[PDB]
Chain length 180, copies 3
């Protein structure tokens, strides 16, 4: 049974031996990353023939978000479990995509209102849920030692979702609307 | 008029005579349950010919979430209003579904990335919004006496959404993807 | 490059010279408004031939939410930047729509469960995300001087989304379901 009932009184296990209240900032941080991961799954389910080129990288992001969650669930002083997430390669990978998608779409200097195609709009939702998760991670960092590589990656990831959302509109030739 | 303007300065009425700031943990708790309820409505709107068997129980969950919200909005010491939510029957009902859906889908021991069909992905989003609401309920419980039956049910409900999401993928023969 | 990396350590610039941690209540408040704005974009992407009459006003709301975010990002004592958002005209505009949509749909005295068509369900999600943003704005207001016009408008806006959701169901002749 996936239901153990052990969480019925409001406490839960993290990685290692510690238990925490479910509203503890650590649990909120990796919980928000799980919410983001689920939204990325939902976004991927909206891919169509015009936007197939985005499918594989969204799946890759889901794998990465699991790695980020793992590290957020791991206390820095846990002897039996180490941080596994290293920002450099995944973050450079995001930056290459951001560069490519920024270059290819029509240039703007004005704010774009988030929207357009259903997929582009979902990528803007991903952008903002990523940023909400990021706020939670910073709340955790102010109380506990974290793997700061996760913060670097999560920061860059919301720029990826912005750039990808504009690219998704481009792929269907849907214009972005500007803030008046 | 549904707009009374009484909330324009940031305070609002709960059940009974009390008013609270809108960011009070009580208001946040039943507000998050309302957000979950709206997401469940959205998820139900995605039902298709393959997944019709899930429609009625999602509606039932919406009725239950209203009952949970009511109790969260009710102070334990309110003389004129009592708790109405009793966990036993609805929670056993969820567990029977969890058992049936766990049994029928392909077995895994590895983490599944949340996604697949649009409905399954939406059920994973429901899973994570349920868990966010749960965190809020625990925040409330640490400051005020609550109907702990709501916490039991909300805990079990996110396991229901996990099991139902895998079942929704099964109903369309969409494989779950595993964490590498 | 849209990625400056300046946020990689958890601090960010608001309007004017101040930097704040990303979990600061000010950043959370306008961050939640950005999340709402993205959800409004997503909702607009669901418009169909039955519901085209709702498209333009959703776009207008997105423009207004940018104005609200701007003011939330602006300290009251910032000498170089002023509040731009004035509630009266946009709020009266919302109230006229609320009146018109309340009048036209079938009357109820009982709670409606949030759902129905995909668009109506998305408008209920908008309703609840608006209310979450509102809670964040009240958290900010309790610590800092804000443009209270934003709070007035955001309060009224969740009533707009309720009324519009019922109207979206009406436009497709989808009944609302009542709480038993
Ligand atoms: C951390 C953790 C997670 C993390 C995963 C890591 C991360 N990205 O942060 C998150 C929060 C995502 C997660 C989610 C869930 N997990 Co988990 N996870 C754990 C935990 C604490 C560590 C497991 C681990 O990494 N193994 C070491 C390598 C354990 C608790 C334990 N026993 O260690 C559970 C635990 C494995 N997971 C559990 C469950 C039920 C879940 C969820 C189904 C809960 C839910 N209803 O959403 C989901 C499933 C997610 C999925 N898509 O498969 C149960 C499994 C029970 C069982 N016998 O099947 C465990 C044992 C916790 C418990 N005792 O209740 N969890
Ligand atoms: C608690 C409560 C809710 C809860 C419902 C209970 C729960 N599940 O937690 C929640 C937060 C879900 C809710 C939502 C809304 N409710 Co309400 N609800 C109340 C409240 C406080 C109690 C009503 C009650 O249960 N009656 C006793 C049995 C009252 C305030 C009051 N006057 O008592 C309003 C109140 C009935 N609701 C109100 C409104 C407007 C709403 C919303 C439309 C607000 C919004 N824009 O989202 C939604 C509608 C939800 C729907 N789908 O029908 C107004 C109705 C005004 C009117 N004359 O029509 C009231 C009177 C509050 C107010 N004075 O502003 N609310
Ligand atoms: C406040 C602000 C926003 C607000 C907008 C105002 C509001 N509604 O609250 C919000 C939070 C919505 C926002 C979002 C983003 N913004 Co902004 N915004 C700012 C800020 C602080 C003020 C700009 C402004 O209003 N100009 C004065 C009139 C600046 C920082 C600065 N340099 O002033 C950036 C800044 C302009 N924005 C930036 C970025 C990258 C973004 C986002 C792409 C971030 C993201 N990944 O989501 C999004 C894009 C949103 C869109 N749809 O176009 C960067 C632009 C970098 C560049 N050279 O292109 C800036 C310069 C911040 C930075 N240094 O990192 N932001
Ligand atoms: N509401 C929540 N939000 C975020 N993370 C959670 C929440 N509840 C539990 N967790 C984390 O996710 C893991 C899996 O959740 P799960 O629901 O199985 O835990 P539980 O609630 O403690 O147990 P059970 O649900 O079996 O009573 C937990 O071990 C914990 O790390
Ligand atoms: N932002 C919010 N988040 C969660 N719950 C809320 C919020 N605002 C109000 N509530 C709760 O939901 C009920 C209905 O909300 P409603 O918007 O009608 O209240 P209000 O904002 O106090 O009044 P009004 O909107 O008419 O000025 C309230 O009585 C209160 O219990
Ligand atoms: N996680 C967040 N949530 C909400 N608002 C944010 C967040 N991060 C930054 N902001 C606000 O949004 C604006 C744009 O965000 P952006 O990501 O460009 O900032 P940054 O993270 O400080 O910089 P960079 O991402 O280039 O390292 C910021 O100037 C700040 O006002
Ligand atoms: K469980
Ligand atoms: K109201
Ligand atoms: K940036
Ligand atoms: Mg950033
Ligand atoms: Mg649980
Ligand atoms: Mg209100």
């Amino acid at each position: 049974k996936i239901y153990t009932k052990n969480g019925d009184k409001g406490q839960t296990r993290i990685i290692g031996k510690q238990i925490l209240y479910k509203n503890d900032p650590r649990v909120a941080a990796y919980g928000e990353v799980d919410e983001l991961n689920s939204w990325v799954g939902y976004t991927k389910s909206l891919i169509n023939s015009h936007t197939q080129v985005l499918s594989n990288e969204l799946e890759e992001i889901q794998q990465l978000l699991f790695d980020c969650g793992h590290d957020l669930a791991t206390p820095a002083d846990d002897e039996r479990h180490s941080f596994k997430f290293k920002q450099e390669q995944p973050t450079v990978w995001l930056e290459e995509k951001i560069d490519n998608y920024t270059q290819v779409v029509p240039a703007v200097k004005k704010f774009i209102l988030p929207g357009g195609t259903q997929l582009a709009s979902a990528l803007h939702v991903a952008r903002t849920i990523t940023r909400r998760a990021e706020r939670q991670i910073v709340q955790l960092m102010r109380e506990e030692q974290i793997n700061q590589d996760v913060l670097i990656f999560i920061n860059r990831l919301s720029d990826y979702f912005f750039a990808a959302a504009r690219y998704a509109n481009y792929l269907e030739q849907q214009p972005d609307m500007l803030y008046r």
